[PDB]
Amino acid sequence: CFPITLKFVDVCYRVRTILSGVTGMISPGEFMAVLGPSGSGKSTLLNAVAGRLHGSNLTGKILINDGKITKQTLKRTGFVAQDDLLYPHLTVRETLVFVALLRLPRSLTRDVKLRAAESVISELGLTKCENTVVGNTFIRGISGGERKRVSIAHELLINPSLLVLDEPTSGLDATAALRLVQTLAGLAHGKGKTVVTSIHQPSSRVFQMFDTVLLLSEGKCLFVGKGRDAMAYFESVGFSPAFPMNPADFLLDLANGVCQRQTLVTAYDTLLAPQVKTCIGGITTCIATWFSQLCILLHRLLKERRHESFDLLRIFQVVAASILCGLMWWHSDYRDVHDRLGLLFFISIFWGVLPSFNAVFTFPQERAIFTRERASGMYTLSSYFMAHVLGSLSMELVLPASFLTFTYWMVYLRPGIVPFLLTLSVLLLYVLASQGLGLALGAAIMDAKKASTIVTVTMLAFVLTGGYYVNKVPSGMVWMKYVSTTFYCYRLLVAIQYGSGEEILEEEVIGDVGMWTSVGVLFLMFFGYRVLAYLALRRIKH
Amino acid sequence: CFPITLKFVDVCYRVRTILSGVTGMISPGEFMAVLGPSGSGKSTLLNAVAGRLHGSNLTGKILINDGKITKQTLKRTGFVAQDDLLYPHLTVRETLVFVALLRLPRSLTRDVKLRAAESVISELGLTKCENTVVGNTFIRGISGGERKRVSIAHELLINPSLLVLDEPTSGLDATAALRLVQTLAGLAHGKGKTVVTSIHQPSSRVFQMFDTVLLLSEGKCLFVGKGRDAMAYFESVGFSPAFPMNPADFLLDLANGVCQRQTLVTAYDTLLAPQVKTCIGGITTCIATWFSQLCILLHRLLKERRHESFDLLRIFQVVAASILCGLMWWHSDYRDVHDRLGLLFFISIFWGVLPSFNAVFTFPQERAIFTRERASGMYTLSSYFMAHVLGSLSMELVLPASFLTFTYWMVYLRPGIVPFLLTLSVLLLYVLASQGLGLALGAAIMDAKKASTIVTVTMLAFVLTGGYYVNKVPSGMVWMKYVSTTFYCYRLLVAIQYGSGEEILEEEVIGDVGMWTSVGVLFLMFFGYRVLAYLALRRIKH
Ligand SMILES: CC1=CC(=O)CC(C)(C)[C@@]1(O)/C=C/C(C)=C\C(=O)O
């Protein structure tokens, strides 16, 4: 009930000039294709007419519906990008319901907000595959011609009226590239939209689906016409095919100089180009809509935190370490101290290296998805950060709580329920204070290979200064132990099992720092590493 | 000076039947294309006519030059496969010289064996790019249209006369797919070869380069003719295009039933198919040619072992560990034993975990290249295995020999040159006996992710039983220490630094196993892990 008339009369985009003099207008109900050679600037004319390149070095009068490009007339414009950014473990129906709860406004009820994710299922051909998982090339899911049809459905929830795609039929085979163009011509004809696209190398019966074409040979345009008379035009200039050929291949051969392009630029500006020119509170509301954004993001990512934590090779490493501790220290005796202290220091190494090494892969693997979803009005950074914080400290407390229950009663540590719940609490605090070091380095580096070798050097300096290997620290590096997390875990485990002398009586048992000082620093390192992981994600200003 | 006439009259290939009734003959000097839909069995007719599918379920009379397919008439047949398997760090000229020394026979001199790798450089268009490295999508090297032109040059060194390619112009852009077909039509015309290929979706002026075509729609063939009269044939049956279209797109549309295929199969067998039927010592020699194969393989892989060992993130981890050992134990004193024993056990952990973790990535990353090169008469397994054994024990002795020289003289171990060359020898033997555990597990599993978690569990059981953490092993797992490599390294380092009492006098200093028993087991584990790594590569029978 509201059409749209795109009209651009612009001039060059100097980075060399990518575009130089292009022009043309698009009416409602008109499926248009923009085709040229590779590296000719057809990915820039689309990207600058949806409103994503402006200001610095782009001058022109790209005007939308006899007006001006505005934030008001930009919510009704969907730019389907070239690559697909989806979560693998979600199903196709769960993908489009979680997106529908974030894109659509909050004034609507939750009965039409998931009804409008149901008609988009049937408007495209996504009805047979609404229960299989999406997957990737690791997880066997939907086909490649349907992942593109989901990404088009991501942009049709907001009901746009100018849909600008960017090479849709690239990578698709011969019969899904035809069927995807057939349903895009149904949107422009049967619904009234203004679909604009750029096909790389169209086949012959894909070129019969177009209503308006546009050539681009390194800047300047050669033909802006209806498309059925693209061959009747070029024979008036003196060009014709010498053998039966695809019409989209002849006029794409004319663009890069191959004759059978100096006289094509000149004849356009004198015969065809001066013809289209003639047609020219907010207090208690912003709190409750913050927690509404957080409850949706904990349910999207719940299947992703479960695959990341409960991997079948991370279970085998904990099962294999829980039997070796239970067999080398089987039925230990408490009055030989040098063995009991080596049990309590292996636990501090093992649960400081595993939560901290696997946490550097969280943010580099999702920085391409996040920066697309953020600049679409779905969520800010403070609610995407607090869904990885709260979603990881609920799933990472399952394997160390099962390591210790199986081990504590075979290796014969202190009996009773009160020295067991103190050993469980110090261990689970040391797990949470140790993956914050992984989140702080993985978000300040943004490379999973350069940050996996700095977190290894960092946890090497925390082990050697933990107080077990070297006893006489050489008077210049005594400060090095007060910043290591392994030092504060190991001196708490010994204080629970032995206390302060009086029953074992070598003053490795008697500590030097304290009992409450060691737990007040592991909370300072728990909150202090999630702040420095947020200030490094704020630093990437888009 | 020896042409070849391929002639196949075969019947079905039942795995459902992929092929069912195809036939046809190819003359010398005739560039032929085999085109059909995806999943129609055009990758099987090529793969079975070069001589790579036979015996079990393939029956027919595929005969070469009025004869029979034989090992004699199979050296002159080059099957250029679909994917490219090249080493990245070699240049294009060094790639084709190392292959020319292996493919060509040994009776020739080494003046024409690299002259025949020089004319193949100029016969293809590989003259401008004969000095840039090959690379991959990690290392910036040659373009994608030239990596295919190197893989064609890999097969033209032996000078074939029947060149069978398999989708060459797949992934290439619009103007390198044309230029690659133009030089393949020059081999069939200007040299006299018999080029057979299968193009996926040819453009219009690529289809003008063909001399003979063949359609395949799920088994049976529809047209075997000259190609220029493929449109004059189908109008005699009653099919014609309704709009101007690529001729390779009309008759590929007829294959999968789309009309504008029941009457096409019937009309072929009655009108066109009964027309092509009417035309129907060794003792001292095998030693010296083993070492000649080994000297070529150490020079191919020398740039690959250098990138695998001297990576700039593996240098930083050794530099960062050599300063922490030199600063925590700076100017150590020899008469406090509990600190000196913790220096000697960290060294045993650090150089047992690093050579053994990085050795499991050697054989899984090169099993696709090796099984193609082996079944081409280039090398056997015993000379490919002894080039990874001898090429890795020369490059892995550089970082631990520089760790110990910087560390031994700051941490103040025993003075003199004779206790230093004993500490260097025990360490370098423990490095070589530890990567054999990586080569044994990485060649018995053939997966870099499943074998990286078993080598971590294995080196966890070797640390806890090494004799440092637990002193009183609980009487049932005392056997577990005699198979760990860390136990035999750590008890040798202590025996060099302290001897057997008499100057420090706690019997952790006095050993229990011996001085020569501990070095005779580290040679048994040095030779015993390269045998079990060869018997697991012999197990993959092609
Ligand atoms: C050998 C190994 C494999 C694992 O399972 C993880 C772990 C961290 C425990 C370890 O790296 C052990 C390291 C040890 C014991 C000490 C150290 O660092 O000085």
Residue by residue, DSSP assigns A370-438 as: HHHHHTTTS--HHHHHHHHHHHHTTTTTSHHHHHHHHHTTTTT---SSHHHHHHHHHHHHHHHHHHHHH
Q: How far is CA B367 from the centre of its chain?
A: 5
Q: Show the CA angle centred on residue B75, arms to residues B69 and B76, nearest 5°.
A: 85
The protein residue whose alpha carbon is closest to atom 12 in ligand 1 is B460
Residue in chain B nearest A250 by alpha carbon: B204
Q: Which of B173, B204, B471 to mutate to test the interface with A (most CBs of A within 10 A)?
A: B204
Q: What is the DSSP string of B318-345?
A: HHHHHHHHHHHTTT--TT-HHHHHHHHH
d(Cα A267, Cα A70) in Å, to the nearest integer? Answer: 36
Whether residue A267 sits in one domain with residue A365: no
Look up residue B182 and give its two tokens.
């133009």
CB-based contacts of B28, cutoff 8 Å, min separation 6: B3, B4, B5, B192, B193, B194
Q: Give yes or no for residue A349 CB within 6 A of ligand 1.
A: yes
Q: Which of B456, B454, B512, B460 is nearest to B488 (CA)?
A: B512
The protein residue whose alpha carbon is closest to atom 6 in ligand 1 is A350
Name the residue facing A324 among B339, B453, B461 (closest C-beta): B461
Resolution value in angstroms? 3.2
Q: Give yes or no for residue A463 CB within 6 A of ligand 1.
A: yes
> Known binder of ligand: residue B225?
no
CB-based burial label for A148 (10 Å; 0-12, 13-18, 19+): buried
CB-based burial label for B159 (10 Å; 0-12, 13-18, 19+): middle
Q: Could you tell me if A228 lies within 8 Å of chain B, comparing CB atoms?
A: no
Whether residue A356 sits in one domain with residue A245: no
Phi, psi of A325 (to 5 degrees): -70, -35
Whether residue B164 sits in one domain with residue B154: no
Q: Looking at the DSSP assignment, which residues form a beta bridge with residue A214?
A: A34, A224
Which chain B positions have a beta carbon within 8 Å of A331's beta carbon? 474
Number of other CB atoms surrounding residue B414 within 10 Å? 15
CB-based contacts of B451, cutoff 8 Å, min separation 6: B360, B364, B441, B442, B444, B445
Testing ligand 1's pocket by substitution, the residue of B317, B325, B456, B470 carrying the most ligand atoms inside 8 A of its CB is: B456
Q: What is the DSSP string of B68-87?
A: ---SGGGTTEEEE-SS----
HEC readout, B228-247: CCHHHHHHHHCCCCCCCCCH
E strand or H helix at A33:
strand A32-35
Residue A125 lies in a domain: no
Chain-chain contact of B477 with A328 (C-beta, under 8 angstroms): yes
d(Cα A374, Cα A380) in Å, to the nearest integer? Answer: 6
Q: Show the CA angle centred on residue A182, arms to residues A176 and A185, nearest 5°.
A: 145
Give the DSSP letter of residue A131: S
**B445 within 8 A of B451, measured Cβ to Cβ:** yes
Whether residue A338 sits in one domain with residue A467: yes
Q: How far is CA B338 from the centre of its chain?
A: 49
Q: Could you tell me if B351 lies within 8 Å of chain A, comparing CB atoms?
A: no
Whether residue A264 sits in one domain with residue A379: no
Experimental method: cryo-EM
CB-based burial label for B266 (10 Å; 0-12, 13-18, 19+): exposed
Q: Which of B249, B252, B254, B220 is nearest to B237 (CA)?
A: B254
B53: left (phi over 0), alpha (psi -120 to 50) or beta: beta
Q: Give yes or no for residue A353 CB within 6 A of ligand 1.
A: yes
Q: Which of B461, B439, B425 is nearest to B356 (CA)?
A: B439
Residue A211 lies in a domain: yes
Residue A313 lies in a domain: no
d(Cα A530, Cα B2) in Å, to the nearest integer? Answer: 75
Residue A488 lies in a domain: yes
Residue A134 lies in a domain: no
Query: How remote is the CA of residue A349 from the centroid of ligand 1, in Å?
Result: 7
Boundary (domain end) residue, out of B218, B247, B280: B280
> Known binder of ligand: residue A415?
no
Q: Which of A225, A232, A273, A231 is nearest to A253 (CA)?
A: A231
d(Cα B6, Cα B9) in Å, to the nearest integer? Answer: 10
Chain-chain contact of A231 with B252 (C-beta, under 8 angstroms): no
Q: Looking at the DSSP assignment, which residues form a beta bridge with residue A17?
A: A14
Q: Looking at the DSSP assignment, which residues form a beta bridge with residue B318?
A: none
Query: How remote is the CA of residue A446 from the centroid of ligand 1, in Å?
Result: 26
> Known binder of ligand: residue A27?
no
Number of domain units in chain A: 2
d(Cα A117, Cα A101) in Å, to the nearest integer? Answer: 9
Which residue carries 């696209």 as its tokens?
A197
d(Cα A446, Cα A370) in Å, to the nearest integer? Answer: 13
Whether residue B273 sits in one domain with residue B209: yes
Number of other CB atoms surrounding residue A490 within 10 Å? 25
Number of other CB atoms surrounding residue B284 within 10 Å? 7
Q: Could you tell me if A475 lies within 8 Å of chain B, comparing CB atoms?
A: no
Whether residue A513 sits in one domain with residue A400: yes
Q: How many CA atoms lie within 13 A of A386 on its CB side?
A: 12
d(Cα A213, Cα A224) in Å, to the nearest integer? Answer: 6
Phi, psi of B27 (to 5 degrees): -90, 165
Q: Looking at the DSSP assignment, which residues form a beta bridge with residue B213?
A: B33, B225
> For residue A176, which amino acid is it?
A
Which chain B positions have a beta carbon within 8 Å of A353's beta carbon? none
Boundary (domain end) residue, out of A217, A247, A276: A276
**Which pairs from B129-137 meet CB under 8 Å and 24+ separation?**
B129/B92, B130/B91, B130/B92, B130/B93, B131/B91, B131/B92, B131/B93, B132/B91, B132/B92, B133/B88, B133/B89, B133/B90, B133/B91, B133/B92, B134/B86, B134/B87, B134/B88, B134/B89, B134/B90, B134/B91, B134/B92, B134/B95, B135/B88, B136/B88
Chain-chain contact of B464 with A173 (C-beta, under 8 angstroms): no
Name the residue facing B327 among A253, A317, A477 (closest C-beta): A477
B416: left (phi over 0), alpha (psi -120 to 50) or beta: left
Give the DSSP letter of residue A6: E
Which residue carries 């009996």 as its tokens?
A415
Look up residue A305 and give its two tokens.
């935190």
Q: Which of residues 151-210 of A touch B (CB under 8 A)?
A: 173-175, 201, 203-205, 208
User: Can you state the angle between helices A176-190 and A144-153, rounded to 10 degrees?
Assistant: 20
Q: Which of residues 29-88 of A touch B (CB under 8 A)?
A: 37-38
Residue B225 lies in a domain: yes
Phi, psi of B454 (to 5 degrees): -90, -30
Q: In B91-240, where do the E strands start and end?
A: 162-165, 196-197, 212-216, 221-225
Phi, psi of B222 (to 5 degrees): -110, -30
Which chain B positions have a beta carbon within 8 Å of A246's beta carbon? 203-204, 244-246, 249
Whether residue A247 sits in one domain with residue A175: yes
Q: Could you tell me if A335 lies within 8 Å of chain B, comparing CB atoms?
A: no
**B96 within 8 A of B173, measured Cβ to Cβ:** no
> Which CATH number belongs to the domain containing residue A204 in this structure?
3.40.50.300
Q: How many angstroms separate the Cα of B431 from the Cα of each of B60, B108, B200, B434?
A: 57, 42, 51, 5
Q: Could you tell me if B240 lies within 8 Å of chain A, comparing CB atoms?
A: no
Q: How many angstroms separate the Cα of B380 from the Cα of each of A343, B98, B113, B367, B531?
A: 50, 16, 21, 14, 16
Whether residue B491 sits in one domain with residue B478: yes
Name the residue facing A473 among B175, B249, B328 (closest C-beta): B328
Residue B51 lies in a domain: yes
d(Cα B119, Cα B472) in Å, to the nearest integer? Answer: 72
Phi, psi of A328 (to 5 degrees): -80, -30
The SS3 assignment for A137 reads coil
> Known binder of ligand: residue A39?
yes
Whether residue B402 sits in one domain with residue B504: yes
Look up residue A244 and give its two tokens.
């039966």
Range of the domain at A216: 6-76+160-276
Boundary (domain end) residue, out of A276, A308, A332: A276
Give the DSSP letter of residue A14: B
Whether residue B171 sits in one domain with residue B154: no
Q: Give yes or no for residue B353 CB within 6 A of ligand 1.
A: yes
Q: Which of residues 443-462 of A touch B (CB under 8 A)?
A: 449-450, 453, 456-457, 460-461
Residue B59 lies in a domain: yes
CB-based burial label for B261 (10 Å; 0-12, 13-18, 19+): middle
The SS3 assignment for B178 reads helix
Name the residue facing B469 among A249, A336, A342 (closest C-beta): A342
Q: In B303-399, where do the E strands start and end?
A: none
Look up residue B261 and give its two tokens.
């295929």
HEC readout, B150-165: HHHHCCCCCCCCEEEE
Q: In A110-200, where do the E strands start and end?
A: 162-165, 196-197
d(Cα A463, Cα B373) in Å, to the nearest integer? Answer: 47
d(Cα A83, Cα A151) in Å, to the nearest integer? Answer: 9
Q: Which of residues 355-414 of A touch B (CB under 8 A)?
A: none
The SS3 assignment for B223 reads strand
Q: Which of B120, B179, B175 is nearest to B152 (CA)?
A: B120
Whether residue B247 sits in one domain with residue B222: yes
Which residue carries 């790798």 as its tokens?
B117
Q: Which of B497, B491, B539 is nearest to B515 (CA)?
A: B491
The SS3 assignment for A352 reads helix
d(Cα B419, Cα B440) in Å, to the nearest integer? Answer: 32
Q: Determine the atom of ligand 1 nearest the C-alpha atom of A321.
A: 5
Q: Which of B440, B208, B50, B279 is nearest to A241 (CA)?
A: B208
Q: How close A293 gets to chain B, by Cα (Å)?
A: 36
